[PDB]
Amino acid sequence: PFRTIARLNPAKPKAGEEFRLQVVAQHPNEPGTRRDAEGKLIPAKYINLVEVYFEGEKVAEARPGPSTSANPLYAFKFKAEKAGTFTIKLKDTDGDTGEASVKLEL
Amino acid sequence: PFRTIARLNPAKPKAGEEFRLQVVAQHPNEPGTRRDAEGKLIPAKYINLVEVYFEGEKVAEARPGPSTSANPLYAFKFKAEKAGTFTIKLKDTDGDTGEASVKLEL
């Protein structure tokens, strides 16, 4: 698995307020088209799915696509209604995974 | 130790171009004034030292105090000259540490 960290901004929003969930992943997002010093291709390995869950229910998704940058940041906007925990699951083209969680307290 | 991830934006800056280094840490940053549902003060435990190194030289620093937010983000602007590696070391008030690295390729 690859390192992932989830954070809320503001860290503790109040009920009814809009806030952002930010997920950062340590990942090369290798496209498969770059070559090493010998001219050999470096195999592709990029994040292709990000799923956000809140209290056991899927509430957001992202399909990053190809030609992305290393150590990406994914942002999602939500409205604070009730306290709960966000769990984010990420997957890449090699089948590798990332996972992070962050608690929402009002 | 606590999880830390460093990223650059743009991820691959051009020579002479300004870029941003972002460091995110998974950390509660307890101020020492919060009480749990039981009424127990929650002991302070926050990041109080952030040291950024580039090719062995310390090029950025922060010494945050209490009242900071959970899972903090610290950002610094640099100008790209030569390629090199960023290493960041974090420490908190209990002596726990975080470390991350990101390569600057032009």
UniProtKB/TrEMBL annotation, chains A, B:
Q: Which Gene3D superfamilies is this protein grouped with? A: Immunoglobulins
Source organism superkingdom:
Bacteria
Sulphur oxidation protein SoxZ domain location, by residue? 10-102
Give a Pfam family name. SoxZ
Annotated InterPro entries: Ig-like_fold (IPR013783), Ig_E-set (IPR014756), SoxZ (IPR030995), SoxZ_dom (IPR014880)
Q: Which NCBIfam families match?
A: SoxZ_true (TIGR04490)
Any idea what this protein is called? Sulfur oxidation protein SoxZ
